[PDB]
Structures are given as structure tokens and as C-alpha cells.
Design a binder for these strands. Structure first.
Lengths: 142, 103, 117, 150, 56, 110, 48
RNA sequence: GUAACGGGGCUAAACCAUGCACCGAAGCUGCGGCAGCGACGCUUAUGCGUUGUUGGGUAGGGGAGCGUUCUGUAAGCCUGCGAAGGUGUGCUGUGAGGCAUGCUGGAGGUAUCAGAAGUGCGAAUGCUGACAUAAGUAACGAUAAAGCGGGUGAAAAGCCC
RNA sequence: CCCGGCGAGGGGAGUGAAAAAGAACCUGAAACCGUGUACGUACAAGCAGUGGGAGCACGCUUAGGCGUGUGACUGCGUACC
């Protein structure tokens, strides 16, 4: 005999709305990454990205907890001028508020290509203004 | 409906109507394969058993071919050492078709 | 007795370029790179003869995990409850019922959590 | 190879071959490294081992019923046509004839016969003697071969 | 400079892919003759918008 | 019904004929022949003689009609190449290889 | 005819190594002469 | 350029005191196949039945078999009633290899077993051929340049007038 | 007989057992470049392989989950002498 394994047509997903107003960055983020892989689910497969279809409801107000924030400064060096270059903790929630969650679940996903297919299943939008009214999201408290 | 039984030192999941292949039997085509070493049947519903080789159960089958397979090759190699080796083995089998497994 | 040299090798050559059917570029049209590819191919295959079973085993365990946790027990606590519970060999490869027909699997799990000590 | 001791050379260490001599076996064509010499593959041959290997093949020729022993086999004249009309009459084809006496009339026969062949008992040939359908013999050959095999 | 290894034959057709000859988007005939034309230049018999020019 | 014209030992590098053939590939015979008349370039007259010979034996002989004639294949292959010594800096005598092409036109009504 | 049915006594025909044949063979390169030194090379140097 | 947990993430998901669980290798084990050989039985020139530790492996040693080039049975026997060689595929063996066959091919071929060897290339910054490759990259030979009209010619910016 | 300089080269038609013997004529690999077709390549990534695999073309698969070739995609993963 041989084992059953997943196929791209069989994947269910379903739609989830994640309240983020009671929450903190990582306890949403590692639970969300887990669901977002299909590791919340029975995958039974090494190569099909299953996951949930995830609406994050807000995350515009997500605290990091404790003093690690003011040295979490989202480091990059695009190609110019001596120094490391930086971006505040304060921008990433105050402006484009999705990004704080996006690059929190990102490093929890495998290599290049399959993590790019895992990643593109999350949306956060601006906050308390989500557009997935018509799918009927199932509320989740974490 | 699905069930699990032991062919020998390997254990096999199988369903009703399934033709499956397993490690070699003595038994020929024109004779009956039957398993009382069915460990549970996963039936229509959740099964509650402790003690296996379930006495109110059978998986009834028949032989449909006894043969030997394709020739596989096994390659052993490690570089810079002038170590290269090859072996073959073919392995015997039996095909069974399952009629049993009650509802 | 002048021997020609190579009327044996024409048959080793074409077996190799046939085994090298489906490969990119020189591995399929140039004998030197065909020979290289056959050796690495069969080494990879041979690590993955064993490696396939370990990889899948990760998946056998994680599908049983989602099932069990929907049934409010953690996987290791369920397996130790079933171990403590009387006989049954069970298997990690067992639950076809985790992804489809999911009505079932609860009775074993429910037994194991209770028997736990 | 003659006509040159030249080194093609122009040093070693210059993006190329060691380029030693113009007469080297690897030099395309004109001579290869192990090409053939004159052969003589014959040995002593041990005389007590040889004669008893002919006692072996001679015993088998009576045990296998290939030894007919026609009494004083001969033709009148050194003509193929007499010997060929005799063999058909005796109901024999492709047989090894042993002359005991090198009489010319049997010794100049059989040339026209496609698979029939004539040898002398003197130092009887062991490669021939295990072949052929029958050994025809004369009683005169059985004597003179036996005195050679002692 | 030089190169590391021998390049692929798919590379030679890719490097040539933009340098190739491009379509003419069909043709012209005269308003005034059964002679065929060359788009927006003049034939030897002057036919473009009739008349006559250039009788060489 | 099909006719081959080939022109073997033709005076071209083959990339340069393939440049011209690939423009006129699949066009149907009469338009490919106009597009070919009014490109002045030397590679294009060389190919015309074989495009024209192909269509022309379809207008005669074994053919019938040319209104439904279309250029079923158009392609160019490496003909037998000649090696010549190129004169060059510091008395360098490297090889230049003088290419020809064997150019194939096939027309059919198919 | 009976010629061409003889054979040697058991193990009398030893056959012997050829050396320098195949790369999957175990024997090939160095020859059964090991890595480097005077005896891995062709026959030279030291006298009898 | 985070880059002194491998990383995400963690102010408890940490760390310390005690402990239990699980997962986790070709280990440990059973299945199916198989190598050699120890032990006992039949009972041998050859073997076969039960059982058993064993079997990662180079240098290197040793045993055994294969095709290629040629002899010998082969002066036979098969052959345009379709031979070698080329090639795609199936079958088959422990591997080398063996066999069957469509397509090609228009004359050669063949065991068992013994014997001889110029006996299997992919490398020697090895020799030759066909021909690739960076490439349609670079090259337009003292700019003793050229203009435009007619012409030979199938065709002219380089010829001729 | 067709295209063409009167050229070069091929084709048709005809010849022969055979031109899938066409003149460089024996049968004919493999590099080599190009055609024809199928399937594929624009959430797209490294020895290009291995392990898992949607799909589609073709094969009446007695349709009995197959054969044939390719394969989106992706777990895993460093050539040979």
C-alpha cells in the first residue's frame, strides 16, 4: 500500500477574522503562522500549502511588550551611505499598519517559494476597516 | 470502510474493494486469504477497542497474482576513493483483492 | 590480434544515455556529463530510499496532532494515555480519517486521556 | 619508426602536452606502443605424458566403436575416384585414414574428397585423431603406432 | 575578458530575441493604377496619387 | 501537393539567412514574395531564388493551382565549411572559417 | 566430430589479473601498486 | 546588513528546584529478498534440509565470469526464403552482460567448450579529424579619398564609359 | 519539365532490384545547427538531480484507476577524474 497525500484542488482554507486589540505581537504571530501554514490543520502533505484564508481585523495597536521595542529598528542597507540604515518601531504601526504582522510571521515560513505562497494568504489592511464582509469571517479570540 | 491488519513484520491499512500488494505468501491464486489478525476496523464511526486481533471481525481476501516484481538496482558510491559498487535485487510479492470488511 | 576497442562500450554508452533520458542539456547528449549524472542520481535516490520514510513520518504525526487537539488532548499525552490503556499496536500512519471522513478518531483518543495517570 | 629523433618540444609548461619526441606511440599514427613481434608458441612437450595421452584417445576409439580396422585398406593407383568409390561401398563418409606404410597410392588419394583425409601412423597426430567420424586403420598401422606409444 | 564555462544554445537564441526583423503590417496599392506600390514612396511610373513624376 | 527547392553551397552565414526566413515564415506564398521583393538587402535576393523556384514548380509539373499554395516549411542549415588563414597583428595566423548555407524552402497546398 | 570438448583439471587454469580495466571495477587506477613512490611508477631505479 | 539562541517569536514560551511524557537514525526489531561460511541431519564426485553469528569499506590481495580481435569443432550447418552494422523499444540476470523485435541494412553468420591477445577511454594542460564556443561580439589595410549621368550585366556604392 | 546569368543548387518526370544505390554515389553513429509536433516556461530563485505531484496529448487501458511522453509546482539536497 501507499499513503494519501494532498492535491491543490482538495485544499478547503475557510475564512477567519482575528481580533488583534486584546493581543500582543508574537502570541498572535506564532499562532497565526501555524494556521497560515496548515500546521493548525491536518496537512498530510510535504508540498501543498494548505492554510487558512486570514483576515487580521486591526493590529494597528499591537504592543511588542517590554524594552526590546526601542532596539527593534527593522534594519536594512539598500546600497548607499556609510552606516547601517533603520526604521522606527513607531512607523511600522503608525503608517502601513499591516507591515508589523507581515514581517513577524514571514521568518517562520520555509525557504523562498513555498513561504511566498504561505505569506500571500494573509491580509491585515489599515485596521477596523476590513473588506471581507461578504465571505462571512469566523471570529477567533487568541 | 477501512481496517488495519498485519501481513508479517509490516502492518497494512486496506479498505473494502481494494486490490493491494504485500510481502510474499505461500498461498496460490485458486485459494482464500483471510485475516483474524485485524487489529481494529475503523468502520462507519469511531472505534473504542483495547484488545487487538478483534474476535468479532475478519478481512476476507483472495490471491489475484503471486509473482516477482521489477529489478531494482542499488548504487553505492563515495568519490576520490575509487569506490563504486552496484547490486541487484528483485523481491517477490503477492497481489490480494479484499471482499470482507463489514459495515 | 589487433582488437578494435569500443564495440562493447557502444552498449554501455547507449544504456547510460537512455538512463539519462529526461535530463537537461549535456547530461542527455554528451557521454562525460551523462556518466557524472548517473552516479549522483543513484546516490541521491539511495539516500532518499531511507530519507522518504523519515520525511513523511513528520506528516503522519502532525495530522494525528490536529485531530487530537480538536479532541482537546495534546499528542504526547494521548499517545501515553493509549500506551497506559490496554494493548493495541495502533500506528502513526493510521488516520486516513484525519483529513476526510473526520466524524471518526475520537473514541481511541477519548479512551487514552481518561486512562492517563 | 626511423627518419627522425626530433623533439617537437618548445619546452614543457606552456599550456600544452609534455611534447617529448616525434616518434611517441601517442603521435596520431605511424606506430603504436605494444604492436606485434614474431611468435613461436611451441614448448618441449613431455614424452611420457604425450604417449599415455595417445593411449587414452586410442582406448576411447575402441570404446566408442570408431575403430573399424578394415584389413589392408588401399587403392590400386593414386586416384581420388577409386578411394571415393570404395568409401561409398563400405558405407562410410568423412573418416580419418591411417596409412601404416606411406604407400603412395593411398597417400596421393583423398585430395578431391571434401571432408576425407589421410595421415601416417608415424608420430600420429593427436588433434586429428580425436576428430573425424571413424579411424579406418590398417593392421600395419596398429602395429607401428603401438611400437611408437611404448 | 574570458569566460568561465561554455555557454548554452538556448542563450544564443535569447540574446537574439529582441534584434530580429519585425513585421510590415501589410501593404499598399495605387489609388490610380493596377500597379502595386511601395508604402509612402514613389514607383518608377510616378504612381502614388496619380499624375506623373520621375519617368526615369 | 509539395515541391522542395533547396539551394546548396549558397554564399551566406546561416544566422543571416535565418534572420530573413523567420520574418516570412507561415505568411502564405504571395505576400512573403512581396515582403521579399521590396527588401533590398543581399541575404534577401539570395533566398528569393529558392522561394521563387519552390512556388514555380508548384505552378507546373506535379502541382495544381497556386491560389491555395502556402509555405509549409522555411528553414536554413549549415552547408560544408571552408578554412582560410586570416592575416593579423604580430604575424598571427589564426583560422577564419568561410561559411555556406544549404537553404530549404518547402511549399505545399497543405 | 569429437574435437573441442577438452577442459583443465579443477583450478589448474588460474586466468590472472589484467589490471587497468574499468573505473567501477575496484581495480583500475594505480594498478595494484598503491599511491606514489618508485614502485607505483614504471620499473626503474634500485638494482637487484 | 539583524548576523555572539541558526532564525522568526518569547519580558515567560525565560531561567532555577523536582519529575514525567513524547518525538528522534540504515541503531534495537519483524516482514520479503539475498551473500558466504560455522553447527547438526540426510549423506555427496556434485548436493539438499534445519539452524546460526554474519555481510559500511579504500589502498591492496585473492577467487570467478563477460564481450571485442582471431584460431579450433567449422571443408559441417544457417543465409536475399533477408547476414554483419546502424537505431528505438520490450523482455531478462547479481553486474558486466544475455535474448527477442518494429524501423533501418543488401551480404554475411553462429553456439557449447579450449586457446592466443595490439582486448573496453574520459581525462595524460596526450596526438588528428569533423566542428562548436564566447558572437554575429571584433575586422573595413597609411581617408594614392569622390561626385552624378549613361552602359556591359540576371544584378552596381567599389567594374566600364 | 520548373526557377536561373548563359550560372550554382534542388525538385518534378523518367530510368533501376534498390537513387530511404544520384554521381563527393558503399550502410551510417555521435558532436554540430535548424525544422515539425506534443506538453511546459510571466509569486518567477542555486551542480539542475532526487523524493512527492495538479494537468494534458496520445493509447477503444475488455474504462477497471493503467501504458506512453512531458509537467505547473514543491519537501530534500553542494559535479566527476
Amino acid at each position: 500500500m501507499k499513503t494519501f497525500t494532498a492535491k491543490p484542488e482538495t485544499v478547503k482554507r475557510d475564512w477567519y477574522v482575528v481580533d488583534a486589540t486584546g493581543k500582543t505581537l508574537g502570541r498572535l504571530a506564532t499562532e497565526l503562522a501555524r494556521r497560515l501554514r496548515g500546521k493548525h490543520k491536518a496537512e498530510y502533505t510535504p508540498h501543498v500549502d494548505t492554510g487558512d484564508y486570514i483576515i487580521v481585523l486591526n493590529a494597528d495597536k499591537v504592543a511588542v511588550t517590554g524594552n526590546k521595542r526601542t532596539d527593534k529598528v527593522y534594519y536594512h542597507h539598500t546600497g548607499h551611505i556609510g552606516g547601517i540604515k533603520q526604521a522606527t518601531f513607531e512607523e511600522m504601526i503608525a503608517r502601513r499598519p499591516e507591515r508589523v504582522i507581515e514581517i513577524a510571521v514571514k521568518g517562520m515560513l520555509p525557504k523562498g517559494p513555498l513561504g511566498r505562497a504561505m505569506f500571500r494568504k494573509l491580509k491585515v489592511y489599515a485596521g477596523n476597516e476590513h473588506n471581507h464582509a461578504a465571505q462571512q469571517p469566523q471570529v477567533l479570540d487568541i | 470502510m477501512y481496517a488495519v491488519f498485519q501481513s508479517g513484520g509490516k502492518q497494512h491499512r486496506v479498505s473494502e474493494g481494494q486490490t493491494v500488494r504485500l510481502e510474499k505468501l505461500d498461498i496460490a491464486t485458486g485459494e482464500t486469504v483471510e485475516f483474524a489478525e485485524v487489529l481494529m476496523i475503523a468502520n462507519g464511526e469511531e472505534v473504542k477497542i483495547g484488545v487487538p486481533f478483534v474476535d468479532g471481525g475478519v478481512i476476507k481476501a483472495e490471491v489475484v497474482a503471486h509473482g516477482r516484481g521489477e529489478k531494482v538496482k542499488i548504487v553505492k558510491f563515495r568519490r576520490r576513493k575509487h569506490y563504486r559498487k552496484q547490486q541487484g535485487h528483485r523481491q517477490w510479492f503477492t497481489d490480494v483483492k479484499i471482499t470482507g470488511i463489514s459495515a | 590480434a589487433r582488437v578494435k576497442r569500443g564495440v562493447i562500450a557502444r552498449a554501455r554508452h547507449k544504456k547510460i544515455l537512455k538512463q539519462a533520458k529526461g535530463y537537461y542539456g549535456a547530461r542527455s547528449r554528451v557521454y562525460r556529463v551523462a556518466f557524472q549524472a548517473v552516479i549522483k542520481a543513484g546516490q541521491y535516490a539511495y539516500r532518499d530510499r531511507r530519507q522518504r520514510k523519515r520525511q513523511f513520518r513528520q506528516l503522519w504525526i502532525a495530522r494525528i496532532n490536529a485531530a487530537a487537539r480538536q479532541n482537546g488532548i495534546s499528542y504526547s499525552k494521548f499517545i501515553n494515555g493509549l500506551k497506559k490503556a490496554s494493548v493495541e499496536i495502533d500506528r502513526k500512519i493510521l488516520a486516513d480519517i484525519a483529513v476526510f471522513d473526520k466524524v471518526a478518531f475520537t473514541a481511541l483518543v477519548e479512551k487514552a486521556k481518561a486512562a492517563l495517570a | 619508426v626511423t627518419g627522425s629523433g626530433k623533439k617537437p618540444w618548445r619546452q614543457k609548461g606552456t599550456g600544452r602536452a609534455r611534447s617529448g619526441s616525434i616518434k611517441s606511440p601517442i603521435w596520431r599514427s605511424g606506430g603504436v606502443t605494444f604492436a606485434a613481434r614474431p611468435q613461436d608458441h611451441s614448448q618441449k612437450v613431455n614424452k611420457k605424458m604425450y604417449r599415455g595421452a595417445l593411449k587414452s584417445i586410442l582406448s576411447e576409439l575402441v570404446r566408442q566403436d570408431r575403430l573399424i580396422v578394415v584389413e589392408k585398406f588401399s587403392v590400386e593407383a593414386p586416384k581420388t575416384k577409386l578411394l571415393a568409390q570404395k568409401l561409398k561401398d563400405m558405407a562410410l563418409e568423412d573418416v580419418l585414414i591411417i596409412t601404416g606404410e606411406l604407400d603412395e597410392n593411398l597417400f596421393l588419394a583423398a585430395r578431391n574428397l571434401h571432408k576425407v583425409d589421410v595421415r601416417d601412423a608415424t608420430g600420429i597426430d593427436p588433434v586429428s585423431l580425436i576428430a573425424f567420424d571413424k579411424v579406418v586403420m590398417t593392421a600395419d598401422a596398429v602395429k607401428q603406432v603401438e611400437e611408437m606409444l611404448a | 575578458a574570458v569566460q568561465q564555462n561554455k555557454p548554452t544554445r538556448s542563450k544564443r537564441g535569447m540574446r537574439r530575441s529582441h534584434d530580429a526583423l519585425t513585421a510590415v503590417t501589410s501593404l499598399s496599392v495605387d489609388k490610380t493604377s493596377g500597379e502595386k506600390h511601395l508604402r509612402h514612396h514613389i514607383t518608377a511610373d510616378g504612381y502614388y496619387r496619380g499624375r506623373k513624376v520621375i519617368a526615369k | 501537393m509539395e515541391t522542395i527547392a533547396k539551394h546548396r553551397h549558397a554564399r551566406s552565414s546561416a544566422q543571416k539567412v535565418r534572420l530573413v526566413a523567420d520574418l516570412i515564415r507561415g505568411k502564405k506564398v504571395s505576400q512573403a514574395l512581396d515582403i521579399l521583393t521590396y527588401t533590398n538587402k543581399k541575404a534577401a535576393v539570395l533566398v528569393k531564388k529558392v522561394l521563387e523556384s519552390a512556388i514555380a514548380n508548384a505552378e507546373h509539373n506535379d502541382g495544381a493551382d497556386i491560389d491555395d499554395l502556402k509555405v509549409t516549411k522555411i528553414f536554413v542549415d549549415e552547408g560544408p565549411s571552408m578554412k582560410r588563414i586570416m592575416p593579423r597583428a604580430k604575424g598571427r595566423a589564426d583560422r577564419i572559417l568561410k561559411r555556406t548555407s544549404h537553404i530549404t524552402v518547402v511549399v505545399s497546398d497543405r | 566430430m569429437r574435437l573441442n570438448t577438452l577442459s583443465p583439471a579443477e583450478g589448474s587454469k588460474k586466468a590472472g589479473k589484467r589490471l587497468g580495466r574499468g573505473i567501477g571495477s575496484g581495480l583500475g587506477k594505480t594498478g595494484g601498486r598503491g599511491h606514489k613512490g618508485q614502485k607505483s611508477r614504471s620499473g626503474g631505479g634500485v638494482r637487484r
